[PDB]
Subunit: 198 residues, 4 copies
């Protein structure tokens, strides 16, 4: 049974970058809904599978991917943020950044452009290519998870669904991306990097 993870900080810890109302809604409503729906879909899958009901299994895919994906991405998202975050990362991660993207700023530019570029709901990710052994930016529609659909390992994710910023920034998604860099938990990103560079 999948469960809703506690936020690692206070709902208002990311102020003024991401206000409290959003965080609380995002976590207690949006993410909680993914987990509940995921658990429901997964149980139906267990049944379809045991029955060899291929039709049901296939019918269940949209919900499995959307909700499962939602749980995956949001669980990562919370740890990617921190009230003590901001600035730039250090050591290897940074080294890989200035390398795979030129400079930190060129990296921020590229991730932001990828996030603002998403038409409709989606996510902008900083991932790691294990086959190529290097960093790589990608965008996923709706809740499709990075690894499950691209094979890339998620390091830093930026949710651009409107529920992630609309109450505070309205239609101006750019102001949102601008502000979020102030709360990036580079410690966690660094951690995720070193984890797949083993």
């Amino acid at each position: 049974k999948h469960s809703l993870p506690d936020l690692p900080y206070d709902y208002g810890a990311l102020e003024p970058h991401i206000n409290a109302q959003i965080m609380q809604l995002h976590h207690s409503k949006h993410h909680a809904a993914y987990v509940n729906n995921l658990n429901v879909t997964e149980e139906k899958y267990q049944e379809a599978l045991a029955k060899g009901d291929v039709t049901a299994q296939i019918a269940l895919q949209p919900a499995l991917k959307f909700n499962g994906g939602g749980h995956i991405n949001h669980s990562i998202f919370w740890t990617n943020l921190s009230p003590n975050g901001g600035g730039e990362p250090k050591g290897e991660l940074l080294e890989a950044i200035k390398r795979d993207f030129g400079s930190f700023d060129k990296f921020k530019e590229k991730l932001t452009a990828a996030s603002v570029g998403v038409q409709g709901s989606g996510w902008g990710w900083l991932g790691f290519n294990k086959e190529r052994g290097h960093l790589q930016i990608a965008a996923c529609p709706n809740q499709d998870p990075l690894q499950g659909t691209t094979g890339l390992i998620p390091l830093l994710g930026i949710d651009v669904a409107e529920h992630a910023y609309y109450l505070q920034y309205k239609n101006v998604r750019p102001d949102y991306l601008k502000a979020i860099w102030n709360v990036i938990n580079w410690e966690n990103v660094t951690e995720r990097y070193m984890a797949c560079k083993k």
Copy 2:
């Protein structure tokens, strides 16, 4: 050159069902952005076409469909609403409804379920099937327009992108669908119906 249509009523005319802030943002920001982007994309298309640049033409498709679609759907949406709306339609349209869907309420149920069912951004539509000569409900992702992608003729559209309701209803998309029935411009829907039943 495509243009942004004036709203047929006051930004606060649909209160309390859809509040003023949303309407104003939806129209002056969201829709205005579709038209501007559409005009830009279309001009690049004229160039690619004149040059026989098939790659560019294909590269331009995502933007053409998203923005063009946005303009198409929102232009229809505004007329589908009215401060004097609500209730049920009459004559033939209604006749077709009780027929193609059983009862008005069964129709509302089906359109609502189709709208709430949209994962991510999208639209729930009441369309007309010219080939079959009957009504039909459908859901379109993001801004993909009904006719351009299904061949169905749009009659009544319900925007479920979060920017269409989030500021007022938050994550509770159901409350939004519930409230919108109070401002449906059945006169306009009736009009659109009779227009393709010629």
Copy 3:
């Protein structure tokens, strides 16, 4: 464990409309592979599910829908054909076909158009809409199964993947469609229709 069903007739039983070389490869090679691959994928899915590995479940969807759908479609396709097929159906099914498509000939043309209309590999289907209570035509890409992805109950399917006709009709898919109508097993289609009569 899913198994490869035997054909209800010999391989050359449908000559000269669909030669024996195609029937044999289509059944013994393509279908066989779907089944074996389906069993392998499900096994990996039960494991991913057990560990609650959502990422793995999502990554397995393409293989599952493709092989699972392939198994579903071809299993139905084989019974939709008969050395003694051809002609027209009777009673209820024939009636519904006139009611929904004008006439039998018109229906053929509608289903033919949808089948020939498939860009890439795919299927043309005559299905039953349980909610609307009427017949409906639909085209599915690759091996995406009808019921699993549309909800429609499959009645008659026509495979337009190139392996279903290329050795005999080459690129001229229309010649393949014209021919297949000569072996359609309307007895089986009628049975499927009557089955979804509630």
Copy 4:
């Protein structure tokens, strides 16, 4: 008006790796059709654009991408082959291939896997990422063109639609891939590579 390019060699020039019957049908029938259909679609697009009919432009996208892409891919595919092809490339291209894929043999396997990996009709590509400045492998469905849909510059393409190998290799696509490496025109691939060297 787009035109059907002549092959740079005879139809049986690639025997026995790809027989003459396939080369001929593939060129004279499939490619020919893409071109004629592309010209017809563009004509309808210029008209829709002129009238500012967005709905029509959107509805024409499938035909445009499919036929347009088909024309782009095959035009490149023909030059990617040569009766005197085979072996390995040299200098810069060979170097980049070692740098990005480990070795030439590893590359073959990577591109082979991507090509064989295509479920349904499609293409396996060796492309060039202009932004990252390195080689990259990618698979495109149906006739979706590489550059138009991914941004990568096509260097070498392998068509895995069944019409490209079914008459000769039947369902065993791997046999087709093993063979095609014998006629790859690395002179042309090298040229394409050097062209996108900025």
